[PDB]
Design a protein around this ligand. Structure first.
Ligand code: NAD
Ligand code: NAD
Ligand code: NAD
Ligand code: NAD
Lengths: 341, 341, 341, 341
């Protein structure tokens, strides 16, 4: 077993661990540690109880061996003993002792090549930044598109954002088949934890406004990040995110100019075949009249609504839902199960 | 005296009546009657207290002259005596005696020429259908664009949807300045009164879902309507509407292909100018990072977000807000004021 | 084995049928028919997809025959053939042909003895009204309290409201143990299906207001119902309800005067003992810091929050959560199962 | 001219400034400075644009004079020139230089006697803490009850909370007429700035949960505070609070044992009388069926719902609304204006 550590037990950190247990197939690695700036009792409480994902179907038992605090978790006929830490500064983590092979960096606070490496300076072999890269990176991966393009010499990988992981395959698939000249992306997204309950000072003057009562248009790391995966799309794609007051799940609305003839039928049939072949693992298509709440806890990177496809002359639009928490947390798992074979 | 009546004291019908009193200028016509299938006290209560636009600044007192009911409404140094009625069957209404010059159909249930004529058989002389056209109509009017081409012979007239009232000005202005090859619309709309609170049976399986907790991509009457008003744009444009849980205000994401050189600046500059020159009583533009609730009670048909503008090659995206309720309600008064000229 | 039918396939009716399959306990009766005013297609979609409780872990297949429409539902290793009907007039329903032993009236439209007998005319042997009695009932029942006092001759029963199911055991337990001079109830309830999305005509001028954006004080059926169940308490307990914009789950704030010595411990300890002994069936207690989301999909009639328990002098206050849909649906099955052996 | 300064330009700070300009009666004193840890541009935007209360009706202009930042604000035919600051440490502020007669402390952090003194040792003459007292104070004041009891020796004063200012009149008005043996409070409150948007680590584990999706019981400084104001109520009152997913406006449900015969009529007449006579400035009473968003922007410390009063036995309950932002903000101004002569 490879040994994995999560730094930052937030919406992502925590759902990774849930996903470890909830998965239909046992992952061939173990999660052996978690860090956060909060205490264990809080961490365990938010792990157990989730406004978004429900009560956790299993048992968590805190034990104290030595000074080392450990969670004994059990669910889906599977066990894990995890060490709980409360270190603010990553360079001071015990990754060497615990022998951590990969660190899922899920704090938002350590996106640089410099901060990433601090975990390596603390004994870790590899790191995965769970976010768009800030600066330099050894690699920018979207599981199902370029996970095979990881070299073993790669220490600072990025798994990008959820948005990027829905977006990239749509573009890959279509550019490849019909040719995309340019494209523009509207993302309609559930409220995220960085927003404000009420009008409160914030870096973003948009995201300063009450989360629960506003439509809030804003920036998306997705575009800058998608261009580190496909540099050819520089100057050829742009877009933005809209925040609305639902708790979870998002939609991506992508408008593009095709270089060959295109029909609704042809566009939809392409995406279906990909869902059944190369992109089986991460993509699915639906012709059913669903809404956001229907895709909660869905492990796919994207579910395409084929009813929503529109073509006019050479311009086309497609639409796809993703569970921005669940989908992405399963892609972090799937990515670690790839490094070993 | 121009005499107007409102059939359906709804979100629209009540906001029309308020708008009469709240306008800067006094309109050269009077509202003299309203009809709803609800009782008077319910109508008065809802008229006085609004979850969205606030309390009515004024007095409303019920008097029962003859065997008729009247409302005595004093506000903004103005007074009206409005007769209240309760007749589900539009032809049974006394439009003959009251000398109704124009009826505003705000029920939602009577949009066919056939159905709307029932007001003319009641003695009314003209009918503005406050909605998109079901079958045929003598005219289809977006105030500020084609309000002038209404005829004396015209009797059944449509003010279209609010979406349509914001989309047309944009398309007119851009097709005229740059050439639109094709375009596509995403409308992000607040909840509406036809939707459902929890999951409940409904003719549309999408709006059937819980309004408060869902993103609900649905359809827009706003495109069929725009093809009426601008027939030369047939087949150049399509779109769809998303419902999201805020109480009020909507936006449009318009994504078009341009037939000549375009830049973010030159787009934004054309819009600003157009607002200042030809389209001033219905169009504004803002430079600031605002959100939906900043447009509550805005009378404009559309406010353009200058920051939200984007160009990649020949493709471009512009973005406009509007108060779906209040915006539209001012265009109904604005339209009526154009007949007595 | 007994044959059950559901008139009205909404929040309750649909959760009745699911709870039947999801129940870890198999029930000894079968549900063989349902009726609503919407088409099978709408009914299936809504059964399969739910904003509150999620997707159904099962398969639904429609069987259209010469005239009859059936549903073949398979879940949790159980199967059911359910005839689907569309009759707004309960007297005409084929309850004879189908041999319906019990009907559940989850429509909220047939609460009188008069109207509930319309089922008895159509061939049914017994009706349970899924609401508070309106005029006369052969019995008002709270499962876990007086479920044993159902005489086999009783043809028209009532299973009161979700709120009554919780209030009664709380009062029973406390009045028996300490003695209630008087009590006052505050219910804080998620939004219900009868409320309005936006401000719209309604019978109640409070429930006419936009559900999503408003605290809404309102009345409770539960007090009338409680007097029918525990008649000695006439005039000793009043109360009211408050709707807030959550999707599901209610709470109950009972404030009472005690006739003997009360302390926080002594109250909680008794409530614990009940949850363990007499009422381990339908009652649970937590010390943990939970919120509404945590009781979503809990089948208990009431979960007491012991930390919220408070005493000053002779007055005290206790707090209980319940899943207003799921608890109430489970108590209907629980009830139907009690008419056996 | 008294000179006032605001520390913490939040929901209270901003609403305090706004309310200065909106008041019918000019205040015979002036706000001359604000301090927040945020950039002036953020503070100005957030002041101008408000999800809860609207656009500011007036013009704000920034000037940079002698390396000093100022705000020139014009509205309601009034002008204020206000210096903006950014000192996290209160001992460092220039209160002496500006000759500040009263600091308003709206940060939430500096509530201990020793903290609040940092403003005094920084040059200010008096300080009002805009929250319940943390440890001790020179005086805890509710405008309209004990406002005339302030001494010249009271330099650190508490203006308590939104909640306390509604509760103290109710408790006092009734205790005086009828006698209160004991009382228990339930407060239903809108979301506060300090809550979390999604489940996120937090000191309080109830307030850690998603604000827009939960009912969340919590604690209320209002009783500690009311005991400081009415020492005789020690051991005679208690309560707790509930956050629900609305943006603004709270209500208070108060249940008490009377020591004298009570009826509904007699309670409502006493409160109507008090609203008309001694509590006229802070209290009001409505007989209408209204909901939360109707009391938005109301300046009153409380508004009894005459319709909501209930009595059974010696025990009774009364219900009152208050705009938790706007109400309190006026009481700060009203209390500053009571320092004259
Ligand atoms: N939320 C999504 O849907 C989503 C999708 C894709 C990417 N991401 C990215 O994932 C990252 C995590 O976001 P999240 O949703 O988990 O939010 P979150 O704020 O809930 O998670 C942050 C967590 O890190 C903890 N933390 C803060 N400082 C720390 C430190 N110095 N050391 C250790 N722990 C620390 C916080 O207490 C919290 O538990 C962000 O970069 C976000 O942009 C999020
Ligand atoms: N609300 C918007 O944002 C908006 C914008 C543009 C256009 N519209 C159109 O305006 C119409 C009204 O929508 P709304 O939002 O006001 O909905 P609403 O439900 O609030 O208004 C409908 C009103 O009609 C009344 N009514 C029902 N049957 C009637 C009958 N037989 N005779 C008379 N009155 C009757 C209802 O009681 C209600 O007051 C719809 O057709 C809609 O397409 C609405
Ligand atoms: N939801 C709760 O928390 C709760 C709890 C306890 C009891 N109740 C009561 O249960 C009943 C149902 O309420 P609900 O929450 O399920 O609401 P709902 O509106 O979803 O249920 C009503 C259902 O009955 C259908 N219906 C309408 N007319 C009909 C007819 N003539 N014949 C047959 N079916 C018809 C509707 O189409 C709908 O599916 C009411 O009496 C309600 O007050 C509700
Ligand atoms: N909002 C209400 O309903 C209400 C009612 C009564 C009392 N209060 C009290 O008011 C206080 C503030 O609440 P709020 O609603 O203004 O919340 P808020 O979060 O909007 O206020 C905090 C503000 O102070 C600023 N700030 C933080 N640290 C600072 C520092 N060191 N120096 C200067 N400025 C700093 C923040 O950047 C922000 O602008 C709390 O104590 C709360 O109990 C609020």
């Amino acid at each position: 077993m490879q040994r994995i550590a999560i730094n930052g037990f937030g919406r992502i950190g925590r759902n990774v661990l849930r996903a470890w247990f909830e998965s239909p197939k046992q992952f061939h690695f173990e999660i052996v540690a978690i860090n956060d700036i909060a205490d264990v009792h809080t961490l365990v409480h938010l792990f157990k109880y989730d406004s978004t994902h429900g009560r956790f179907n299993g048992k968590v038992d805190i034990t104290i061996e030595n000074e080392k605090i450990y969670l004994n978790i059990q669910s889906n006929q599977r066990l894990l003993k995890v060490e709980v830490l409360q270190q603010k500064q990553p360079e001071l983590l015990p990754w060497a002792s615990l022998k951590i092979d990969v660190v899922l960096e899920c704090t938002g606070l350590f996106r640089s090549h410099a901060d990433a490496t601090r975990h390596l300076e603390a004994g870790a072999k590899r790191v995965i930044i769970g976010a768009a890269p800030f600066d330099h990176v050894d690699a920018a991966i979207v599981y199902g598109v370029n996970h095979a393009d990881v070299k073993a010499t790669d220490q600072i990988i990025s798994s990008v954002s959820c948005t990027t992981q829905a977006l990239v395959p749509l573009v890959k698939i279509i550019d490849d088949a019909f040719g995309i000249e340019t494209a523009l992306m509207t993302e309609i997204h559930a409220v995220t934890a960085d927003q404000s309950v009420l009008d409160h000072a914030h870096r973003d003057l948009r995201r300063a406004r009450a989360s629960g009562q506003n439509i809030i248009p804003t920036t998306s790391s997705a575009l800058g990040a998608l261009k580190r995966v496909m540099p050819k799309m520089e100057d050829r794609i742009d877009g933005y995110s809209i925040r609305v007051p639902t708790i979870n799940v998002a939609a991506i609305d992508l408008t593009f100019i095709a270089q060959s003839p295109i029909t609704v039928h042809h566009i939809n049939e392409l995406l279906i075949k990909a869902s059944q072949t190369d992109y089986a693992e991460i993509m699915a298509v639906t012709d059913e009249p669903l809404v956001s709440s229907d895709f909660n806890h869905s492990p796919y990177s994207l579910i395409v609504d084929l009813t929503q496809t529109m073509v006019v002359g050479h311009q086309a639009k497609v639409f796809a839902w993703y569970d921005n928490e669940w989908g992405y947390a399963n892609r972090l798992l799937d990515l670690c199960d790839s490094f070993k074979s």
